Design a protein around this ligand. Structure first.
Ligand code: HEM
Length: 152
């Protein structure tokens, strides 16, 4: 439950991401994989990446970063009205990719970390608060569908 002022901040911040969706998506995935290496095991096409240099040099990782952040962007632009957009993601991640909700927490914090990293002093406290709440909303709604499916 975000206010209009908070969604405004969210989409304001998202403008930063959209000026370089591939760069942002790349660094988010890298921060995830290096900060929580067990996450890497969920990707049959990234499990080969041992080193961070390999991650950085991988165009397919940047491609997936784009896919992920494009999907997230679409969801964020719905300002909470994302049932249609979210349900298939929740289903594919629960039943096909088998991604525990913990990993969604991991990538949420990673998004936060990357925005500070790429925009130091340009990602204010109010913007962090708004973005955090949005990612929590996202997670909580996924979490509801996970429960429904009985998935851990
Ligand atoms: C912001 C959170 C996320 C978003 C918006 C997102 C979005 C997507 C989308 C759009 C796809 C392709 C369509 C599909 O299979 O449903 C996908 C695939 C996939 N995702 Fe997620 N994802 C997120 C988080 C994660 C996390 C945290 C993990 C694992 C740690 C993960 C693991 C995977 C895997 C293994 C695939 C299939 C990759 C492939 O073989 O092409 N996702 N994701």
């Amino acid at each position: 439950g975000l206010s209009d002022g908070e969604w405004q901040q969210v989409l304001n911040v998202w403008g930063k991401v959209e000026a370089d969706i591939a760069g942002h998506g790349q660094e988010v995935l890298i921060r995830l994989f290096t900060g929580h290496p067990e996450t890497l095991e969920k990707f049959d096409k990234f499990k080969h990446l041992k080193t961070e240099a390999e991650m950085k040099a991988s165009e397919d990782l940047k491609k997936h970063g784009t896919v992920v952040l494009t999907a997230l962007g679409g969801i964020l632009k719905k300002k909470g009205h994302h049932e249609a957009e979210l349900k298939p993601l929740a289903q594919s991640h629960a039943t096909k990719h088998k991604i525990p909700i913990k990993y969604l927490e991991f990538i949420s914090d990673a998004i936060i970390h990357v925005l500070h990293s790429k925009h130091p002093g340009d990602f204010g406290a109010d913007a962090q608060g708004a973005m955090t709440k949005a990612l929590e909303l996202f997670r909580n709604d996924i979490a509801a569908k996970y429960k429904e499916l009985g998935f851990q």
